[PDB]
Enzyme design. Structure first.
Site, PDB file in Angstrom:
ATOM      1  N   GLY A 263      47.359  38.384  56.461  1.00 28.21           N
ATOM      2  CA  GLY A 263      46.768  37.085  56.715  1.00 28.21           C
ATOM      3  C   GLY A 263      46.857  36.136  55.543  1.00 28.21           C
ATOM      4  O   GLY A 263      47.820  36.160  54.775  1.00 28.21           O
TER       5      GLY A 263
ATOM      6  N   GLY B 205      39.846  25.825  43.636  1.00 27.10           N
ATOM      7  CA  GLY B 205      40.281  24.741  42.771  1.00 27.10           C
ATOM      8  C   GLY B 205      40.199  25.107  41.294  1.00 27.10           C
ATOM      9  O   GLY B 205      41.095  24.788  40.515  1.00 27.10           O
TER      10      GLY B 205
ATOM     11  N   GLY C 167      48.798  34.971  69.809  1.00 29.91           N
ATOM     12  CA  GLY C 167      47.840  35.599  70.694  1.00 29.91           C
ATOM     13  C   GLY C 167      46.905  34.557  71.258  1.00 29.91           C
ATOM     14  O   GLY C 167      46.299  33.768  70.537  1.00 29.91           O
TER      15      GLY C 167
ATOM     16  N   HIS D 246      30.031  54.555  25.799  1.00 30.41           N
ATOM     17  CA  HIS D 246      30.223  53.679  24.658  1.00 30.41           C
ATOM     18  C   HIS D 246      31.619  53.889  24.085  1.00 30.41           C
ATOM     19  O   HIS D 246      32.091  55.022  24.051  1.00 30.41           O
ATOM     20  CB  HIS D 246      29.157  53.984  23.602  1.00 30.41           C
ATOM     21  CG  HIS D 246      29.195  53.045  22.408  1.00 30.41           C
ATOM     22  ND1 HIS D 246      30.127  52.955  21.466  1.00 30.41           N
ATOM     23  CD2 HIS D 246      28.220  52.114  22.166  1.00 30.41           C
ATOM     24  CE1 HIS D 246      29.784  51.999  20.642  1.00 30.41           C
ATOM     25  NE2 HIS D 246      28.647  51.470  21.026  1.00 30.41           N
TER      26      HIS D 246
END
Ligand SMILES: Cc1cc2nc3c(=O)[nH]c(=O)nc-3n(C[C@H](O)[C@H](O)[C@H](O)COP(=O)(O)OP(=O)(O)OC[C@H]3O[C@@H](n4cnc5c(N)ncnc54)[C@@H](O)[C@@H]3O)c2cc1C
Ligand SMILES: Cc1cc2nc3c(=O)[nH]c(=O)nc-3n(C[C@H](O)[C@H](O)[C@H](O)COP(=O)(O)OP(=O)(O)OC[C@H]3O[C@@H](n4cnc5c(N)ncnc54)[C@H](O)[C@@H]3O)c2cc1C
Lengths: 478, 478
Positions: free
Chosen positions: A42, A195, A118, A457
């Site tokens: 997409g 943006g 579709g 750490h």
């Protein structure tokens, strides 16, 4: 006209779409996924997430080689200029590999990929129209009878009235991702995350970026403190901000090659004419219901353009579920992935839940801005009494050791239950760190519980641990 | 001599020491911290954590500029060379800022810093002797009448018997940290975390590294699969491996500046004459009780050299706590800090526990290795039936987008309760990502509890989610 049947048809192959289709195939169903464009993923894998983030990471490596390298003890003896062509090829091949991997995942899950438009025929049948290009429908014009259908159509760019977006000189987010020539001036209309990220990648490369926005603060879903600080580190990075400013005109002045812009300030109603080589209209994104035929069956669309639903994700028809960017929620790929799963789980189990209160919003600039839960404004709006506990990355051991100290981790907790209500992190790895804040919110954990978790750490995650320590009690390095 | 009285005294200024000092002071105690060297931070900030990670990050950026830059679309019209002096200075500045930061914190929290060596007069009091070229070596002796004594004397490099550790040609970890020129060859004797990170630094800079390890597996505290795969990517990076090999003899030669190492393969024993420019001797780190005067009051030390304690950190004397590297447990800075805070809050509450089953171990190479909880081998021995969930970073969205796909995530869950027993991450940011697994182990969260949390897109944290998802059920992207 050729008729076939499936348990589920997903109309759209984006984060909500391809994910819903894979989960359904895993849940025993005979699944279908109807995608209009030649690739899957997409908007996020072709025009969104993956393109912008590839550009954003590579622009930061050009930026570190130009600014940080000398200080890190690395001498680059000569010029360092960006090859726009291979910069684009690094991005294109990532898109190519990820979209080619979704098609392979469909093939392994046995999801029939219908490469065409579709649309509804009935409130049971879907007309798979052929589209121009590679593989139209599945040897022309299909009609598919389905028991359950999940509409996962996406979004499109909101156009600005009067501005003709010719993606060449007046581009949108999509035009901006493919610019084969870096502008001397890039003006952007829109202070949102899209943006701001597009401003970052090109300013790192050489563009004199300006960001016109009608609202005072930027990234308008952000915490107030985090947003004002986001203006400040981007302004140090070279982004100009014309805030409380509405744009009036924008026209290609092809004689001079310059997109002649005209804006107006809100506090003082005078107008300036601006000049930029490329203009970007990143004012927003709106739903895409076109070509789906919501008007045939009477699937309700609201004043924003969004297909309405209930908490069970379906529209007026119990078998037609709407998920993604066309429906309600923040327009985020992982929000859509969660809905694609939850909708499909509802068809096999009758249960599924997307925690809308634990959806992360991450801007992938450098430093990365990321946040889960409620902002300060939202808790004061609700009347919730809260304790703030932030910790600067300047105090974090790995941040200083890596000479990357911009930002802070801010933990907002409830004053009487001490549980984490919000987590707003400006910092390196903030999109990664918010995952820790996400898991802590899902369990309803206190600032004390994560403070008691042993964090390694030196890591940046210690900033989280100690921001939480500062929230209920006192931090060690603060 | 001058005799002053304090509530708590810490003999040592390392991770365990200084956080214990800051926490005791924050808990109202009259705290004093005795540190023999000129700076706080102990081994970690001065010759440990902070310097090696600084060299690890800057060399990685050199490595990205030298190999990955053109592929990212950045063409350098010149010559990329590492300036060892500016590289070393970057390291030094990090160490300098960090150490100075703890002195600023000691002034803020009102801790009494004694620059000098601490010793036992008797069990009820400590003596701070002046040192030598120490800028502030407490004029003449101090005899502190203390109510509680915390011993955070830490550790020291374990010398390999028969090898003269001169910090020039036969270096230890401290030596290799300050190496002024990149050696043509670097033979390391010690396949652990320290030796492997130091191998990564110099293989990235120009050295042909050869690691030598007695046992048939490197970095052993790791999982079997993680250790086979860590050896594979480091070999891929240019590090040779001499596993099941012991060093017989090694002697510095200056008639040709070469340390002539002589090794032997433990299975089918036959001698080989190796050569190197420098020789790292990173066989281990053993406790440091020297100059403490432990033996004077009869403080119990075991056969391994550790200062023995009970569950509540007390020695045979109930007011003398012993924390950090000098006592039991893994030699990690964060482990030490947790022990520091626990020993101090025990003086306030009467109780305190550190979850030793929830302590990460991070190798800061690239890709980073990081693990918390039970290993597969630890689970086979304990008779625990367990399910495995694995998700590669090649299938992760942000890893593929950044062209940094090396590694996997491996969640080990119980078959019966499905809770996360262990988590083993090889990959970019694995040290940051293991903190999410850290919250999981603390809350007794299952593979489903992490798979259900909404992880942001595109991030590496999604690989954690998908590996948990694959552990109890099925992953969406593989
Ligand atoms: C190259 C290298 C890299 C490492 N990387 C990491 C890493 O990434 N992460 C990690 O967690 N750990 C790392 N470690 C280990 C880390 O250094 C130790 O775990 C940590 O420093 C232990 O803290 P400590 O407080 O016990 O003692 P230490 O930091 O060792 O310091 C104790 C201090 O006690 C003092 N002292 C000793 N005896 C006396 C005395 N008699 N009187 C007065 N003062 C005294 C000083 O000598 C000393 O600095 C690394 C170690 C090395 C060598
Ligand atoms: C530049 C940019 C950067 C972004 N970065 C991020 C980020 O970092 N993180 C994040 O979470 N989100 C990001 N987003 C937003 C993200 O792209 C969307 O939230 C995400 O794509 C939503 O998935 P979706 O399945 O709803 O829709 P989409 O991915 O848009 O896909 C739906 C698909 O439906 C197809 N379709 C539409 N109508 C029909 C029809 N009638 N028949 C058949 N097929 C049809 C479309 O062609 C499309 O491919 C970004 C967006 C942009 C523009």
């Amino acid at each position: 006209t050729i008729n076939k049947s499936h348990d589920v048809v997903i109309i759209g192959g984006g984060p909500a779409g391809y994910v819903a289709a894979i989960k359904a195939a895993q849940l025993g169903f005979n699944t279908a996924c109807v995608e209009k464009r030649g690739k899957l993923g997409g908007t996020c894998l072709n025009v969104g997430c993956i393109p912008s983030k590839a550009l954003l990471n590579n622009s930061h490596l050009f930026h570190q080689m130009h600014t940080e390298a000398q200080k890190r003890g690395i001498d680059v003896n000569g010029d360092i200029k960006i090859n726009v062509a291979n910069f684009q090829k690094a991005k294109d091949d990532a898109v190519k590999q990820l979209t080619g991997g979704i098609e392979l995942l469909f093939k392994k899950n046995k999801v029939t990929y219908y490469k065409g438009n579709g649309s509804f025929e009935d409130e049971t049948k879907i007309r798979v129209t052929p589209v121009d290009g590679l593989e139209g429908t599945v040897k022309e014009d299909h009609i598919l009878d389905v028991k359950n259908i999940i509409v996962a159509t996406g979004s499109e760019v909101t156009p600005f009235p009067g501005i003709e977006i010719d993606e060449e000189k007046i581009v949108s987010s999509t035009g901006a991702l493919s610019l084969k020539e870096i502008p001397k001036r890039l003006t952007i209309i829109g202070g949102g995350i899209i943006g701001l990220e597009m401003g970052s990648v090109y300013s790192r490369l050489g563009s004199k970026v300006t960001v016109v926005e009608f609202q005072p603060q930027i990234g308008a879903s952000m915490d107030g403190e985090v947003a004002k600080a986001t203006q400040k580190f981007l302004k140090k990075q070279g982004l100009d901000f014309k805030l409380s400013t509405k744009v009036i005109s924008a026209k290609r002045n092809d004689d001079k090659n310059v997109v002649e812009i005209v804006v107006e300030d809100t506090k003082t109603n005078k107008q300036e004419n601006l000049e930029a080589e490329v203009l970007l209209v990143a004012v927003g994104r709106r739903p895409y219901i076109a070509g789906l035929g919501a008007e045939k069956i009477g699937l309700e669309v609201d004043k924003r353009g969004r297909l309405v639903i209930d908490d069970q994700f379906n529209s007026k028809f119990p078998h037609i579920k709407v998920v993604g960017d066309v429906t309600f929620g923040p327009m985020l790929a992982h929000k859509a992935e969660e809905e694609g799963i939850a909708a499909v789980e509802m068809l096999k189990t009758g249960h599924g839940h997307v925690n809308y209160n634990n959806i992360p919003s991450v801007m992938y600039s450098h430093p990365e801005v990321a946040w889960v839960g409620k902002t300060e404004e939202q808790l004061k709006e609700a009347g919730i009494d809260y304790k703030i506990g932030k910790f600067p990355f300047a105090a974090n051991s790995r941040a200083k050791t890596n000479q990357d100290t911009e930002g802070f981790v801010k933990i907002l907790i409830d004053s009487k239950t001490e549980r984490i209500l919000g987590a707003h992190i400006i910092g390196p790895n903030a999109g990664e760190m918010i995952a820790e804040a996400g898991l802590a919110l899902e369990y309803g954990a206190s600032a004390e519980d994560v403070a008691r978790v042993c964090h390694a750490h030196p890591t940046l995650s210690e900033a989280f641990k100690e921001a939480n320590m500062a929230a209920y009690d006192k931090a060690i390095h603060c």
